C-alpha cells in the first residue's frame, strides 16, 4: 500500500514540530561531525581510512577544481566543499537508514532552492568580480545583433541554479518514492539493486551538483 507524501515546508516560516527535513539534516550533520572527530584527534602522519576521507575526496576535489578552473577554485574552494560532504550525506541518511519512513513510531523544496540562491550569490558577488561589467558583456551591446539572446542566456543563468535545485529536490525525492513503491509491492528492495542504484544515483547527483556549481563559476569567469 503506497503511503508516500511530499514533505514540502517553508524555510522562511519557523520550523515545524516534526521538521523531517531539519531532523534529517541534523542527523547528517551529527554523522559528519562524528566522522570528523574520529579522524581529527586520531590522526597520524600517514593515517589509513581516517585521512583517506581528506585525501581521496577533499584533495581530489581540489585537484579536479584546479584542473577545471585553477586559482578561481581557491577563491570558491569552500563553495563546492560545502556542496560536497552534504546532500549526499543527507541522501545516505535518507536512504532508509533504519526506519526509512516505515514504522518510525535534499528533497525539501525550500532547502534546495535556498542552496540555489546561495549558488546565485557566487555569481552575485564573486561572479564577474574580476570585470564588474562582465554581466553586461555580449548582452544587447553594439554587437547585440549577434548577442540578442545574451540577456536570455543570463536569464538561463538565472534559471540554471534553480533548475539545479530541481535536480537536488528531484531524484532524491524520486528515490524515496521508488523505495516506498518497492515496499508496497515486490518487497525486500527489488530484483535490481534498488537500494544500491539509489545510493549510486544520489552520490552521482551530489557530485554532478558540485561540478555544475564549479562549471557555472567557470562560465561566469568567461
Amino acid at each position: 500500500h503506497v503511503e508516500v507524501a511530499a514533505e514540502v515546508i517553508f524555510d522562511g516560516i519557523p520550523g515545524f514540530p516534526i521538521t523531517n527535513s531539519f531532523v534529517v539534516a541534523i542527523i547528517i550533520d551529527i554523522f559528519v561531525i562524528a566522522l570528523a572527530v574520529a579522524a581529527t584527534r586520531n590522526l597520524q602522519m600517514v593515517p589509513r581510512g581516517l585521512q583517506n576521507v581528506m585525501e581521496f575526496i577533499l584533495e581530489s576535489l581540489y585537484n579536479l577544481f584546479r584542473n577545471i578552473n585553477a586559482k578561481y577554485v581557491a577563491t570558491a574552494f569552500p563553495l563546492v566543499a560545502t556542496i560536497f560532504l552534504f546532500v549526499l550525506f543527507g541522501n545516505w541518511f535518507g536512504l532508509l537508514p533504519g526506519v526509512g519512513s516505515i514504522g518510525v513510531c535534499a528533497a525539501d523544496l525550500n532547502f534546495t532552492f535556498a542552496i540555489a540562491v546561495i549558488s546565485f550569490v557566487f555569481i552575485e558577488y564573486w561572479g564577474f568580480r574580476a570585470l564588474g561589467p562582465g554581466y553586461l558583456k555580449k548582452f544587447f551591446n553594439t554587437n547585440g545583433i549577434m548577442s540578442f539572446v545574451g540577456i536570455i542566456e543570463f536569464i538561463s543563468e538565472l534559471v540554471k541554479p534553480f533548475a539545479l535545485a530541481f535536480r537536488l529536490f528531484g531524484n532524491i525525492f524520486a528515490g524515496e518514492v521508488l523505495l516506498v513503491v518497492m515496499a508496497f509491492l515486490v518487497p525486500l528492495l527489488l530484483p535490481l539493486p534498488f537500494y544500491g542504484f539509489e545510493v549510486f544515483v544520489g552520490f552521482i547527483q551530489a557530485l554532478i551538483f558540485a561540478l555544475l556549481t564549479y562549471a557555472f563559476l567557470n562560465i561566469a569567469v568567461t
Partner: peptide
Amino acid sequence: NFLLLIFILRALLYRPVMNLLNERT
C-alpha cells in the same frame, strides 16, 4: 543550519588541508 555545518566542515578541512600541505612538503 547549513551555514553552521559549513563553517564546522570548513574548519575541519582547513585542519585537513594543513595536514595535507605538511605531508606534501
